Amino acid sequence: EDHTEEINDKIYSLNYNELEVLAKNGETIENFVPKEGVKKADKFIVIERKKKNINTTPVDISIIDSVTDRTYPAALQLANKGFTENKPDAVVTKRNPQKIHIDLPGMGDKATVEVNDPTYANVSTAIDNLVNQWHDNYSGGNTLPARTQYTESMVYSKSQIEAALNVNSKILDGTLGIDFKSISKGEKKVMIAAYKQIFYTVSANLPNNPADVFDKSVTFKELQRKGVSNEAPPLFVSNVAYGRTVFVKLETSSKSNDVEAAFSAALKGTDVKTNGKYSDILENSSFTAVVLGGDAAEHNKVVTKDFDVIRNVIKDNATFSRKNPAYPISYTSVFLKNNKIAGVNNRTEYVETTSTEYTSGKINLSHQGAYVAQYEILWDEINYDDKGKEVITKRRWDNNWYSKTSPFSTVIPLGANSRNIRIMARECTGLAWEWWRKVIDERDVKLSKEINVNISGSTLSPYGSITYK
Numbered sequence: 001e002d003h004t005e006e007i008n009d010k011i012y013s014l015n016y017n018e019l020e021v022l023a024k025n026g027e028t029i030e031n032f033v034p035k036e037g038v039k040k041a042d043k044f045i046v047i048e049r050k051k052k053n054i055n056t057t058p059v060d061i062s063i064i065d066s067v068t069d070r071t072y073p074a075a076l077q078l079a080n081k082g083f084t085e086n087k088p089d090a091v092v093t094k095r096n097p098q099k100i101h102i103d104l105p106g107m108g109d110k111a112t113v114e115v116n117d118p119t120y121a122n123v124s125t126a127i128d129n130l131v132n133q134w135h136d137n138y139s140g141g142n143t144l145p146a147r148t149q150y151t152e153s154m155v156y157s158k159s160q161i162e163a164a165l166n167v168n169s170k171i172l173d174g175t176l177g178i179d180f181k182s183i184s185k186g187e188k189k190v191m192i193a194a195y196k197q198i199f200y201t202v203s204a205n206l207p208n209n210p211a212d213v214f215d216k217s218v219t220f221k222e223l224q225r226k227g228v229s230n231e232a233p234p235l236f237v238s239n240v241a242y243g244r245t246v247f248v249k250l251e252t253s254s255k256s257n258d259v260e261a262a263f264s265a266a267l268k269g270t271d272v273k274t275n276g277k278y279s280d281i282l283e284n285s286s287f288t289a290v291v292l293g294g295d296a297a298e299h300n301k302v303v304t305k306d307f308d309v310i311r312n313v314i315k316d317n318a319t320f321s322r323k324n325p326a327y328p329i330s331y332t333s334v335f336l337k338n339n340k341i342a343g344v345n346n347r348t349e350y351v352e353t354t355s356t357e358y359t360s361g362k363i364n365l366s367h368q369g370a371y372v373a374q375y376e377i378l379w380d381e382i383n384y385d386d387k388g389k390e391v392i393t394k395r396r397w398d399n400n401w402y403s404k405t406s407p408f409s410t411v412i413p414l415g416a417n418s419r420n421i422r423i424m425a426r427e428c429t430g431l432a433w434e435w436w437r438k439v440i441d442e443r444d445v446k447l448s449k450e451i452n453v454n455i456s457g458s459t460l461s462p463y464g465s466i467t468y469k
Contacts, residue, residue: 003219004211010220011210011337016079016230018335019057019345024084026054026159026348034388037417044358044416045255046384047186052352054163057343060149060241060330062086062167062196065295071331072123073240074098074115074204076213078232079335084344086168091226091234094215095119099205102130106138127202135322144320146197146243149330152267154260155183155190156350163346165194167247175290175299176249186355191250191263196329199243199320206238210336234336242326244317245292248310252285255357266307282307289313294327360416361447363423366454367408369462371427373439373455376400379414379421403428406456414447421445423466429459439464 029051037046063071063086070077070090077088098118102111110133115126153164155178162169172178172192182188207213213236220228228234250263262278263285265271272278289310291300302313320326333342367373377400381393397412414421425440439455439462448468455464 002216003214004216006220007211007214007218007223008209010223011234014230014233014337016233018338018340018342021079021231021233022084022342022344024163024344024346026163026346027157027350029349029351032351033386035384035390036388037382037384039416042360042416044360045186046356046358048354048356050352051349053347053349054160055345055347056163056166057345058166059332059341059343060166060196061333061344062171062330063240063328064168064171065328068328069120071237071240071328072120073100073127073202073237074118074123074213075120075237076336077235077237077333078227079235079342080227080232083235089227089232091223091228092119093218093222093226096213096215098123098213100126101203101205102127102134102200103203104131104134104138104144104200107134130202131200131326139321141321143324144199146199146318146320148318149196149198149241150193152191152193152264154263154352155180155192156352157348159346159348160350161192163348165192167194171292172247175292175301176247176288178249184351184353186353187253189252189254189259189263189355191260191267193248193250193267195246195248195314195318196241197243197246197318198241198329199324199326201239201241203239204237206334206339207236207336210234213336235333235342236336236339237331237333238341240331241329243320243329244324244326245329246314246317247288247290247292248314249288250285251288252281254281254284255355256281257354257356270308270311272307291317292327292329294325358416358418358447359449361414361418361449361451363412363414363451363453365408365410365412366452366456367404367425368406368456369427369439369464370406370457371429371459371462372403372405373408373425373427374401374403374436375426375453376424377412377422380419381415382417382419414451416447418447421447421451423451423453425453425455425464427455427459427462431459437462440466442466 032049035048076091095118097114097116099114115122151165155161158169258277262281287310288303293299377397379395383391423445426436426438429437450469452467457463
């Protein structure tokens, strides 16, 4: 008996929204403080937050080799929440014959085979046999460079990093370690990069009609009991990518604003050695590389302060040879009904936290000039609240404009949240056409640990200098 017409008619009758059935929705960011500052001890710590959006729709879906088993070329699966979290449900029935094609170079003809009973086991075996033929007859023992699928991103939330890298956050967090709390606190800054090094892909000819994949004895009622419905419509796996995945984490508690740029540059090339604060930041950073194996037990983790060690890890896993086995890393699927490519729409909101630090300082005044001197020393104290509003306090040395005589010295304490530092020193020349002469008029001073304002000379020609120790 033949249920072909039935399967077709019932699958064609499924009514669903292709984006909705595989939609992945993240967090909604309600309230947050855009900007806050707080004096620690020596320092002023400014934290800045921005509400941001990610909306992305990958057609490659990562494989976590927990259950799969469930994922191979021409596998059938359900389009449901589990799919979107990299735990697909399989739909296993008796199957018709199925052609698959490997993309390793220089084969026939011999790159395509028909698998009579396309179960996980027979497809796997047919693939193993194709890959071996290639090694034995077509490669010449040469190593095949991977096709690299690369993503990179600062880390802020589980759903954000997931959407950004197109990698399940549980595997990311599980292998690398992501201290999300420290991040939100502005205490850690983390970037993660993912290298999916694709050595070869195996595709499966798309069915002409939905029924073509099922043995004629299969009934729609059977699909229904295997979970098929408007909410979990069937998918056909059209291609699986095989190779190796490397994750890289760059982590620092540095408070520079250049960290993100320093991290991206490090991944880009060794010429980061050729940069001021990039290299200082990296010196204050820690690196982790994980290389995924075929199952959890085979995963490898390396933590190092030498980014060159990381470059070699990446490099040693970017080439295919008999001695560098490949694993399933990602796959594309089409709705069985439609043959339309199936994408997972990640939409999430998150908070992008950046953190800066400022250090308190002292103005050290040195008057050893053979004249009477006055200073005008001004600065602002910046603060924030409570909606991130920058509230400003004007400040003033209490002895502004008081005459001082040589020798004289004092120390003026500037808070770490101090900005817009102006320092003027003038001396009375006793000359009717220029009674007061400015000796220092600076004007926009930098908040060093020490600002050493030194004036001397004679009335007629004085001279002074601000230096920063």
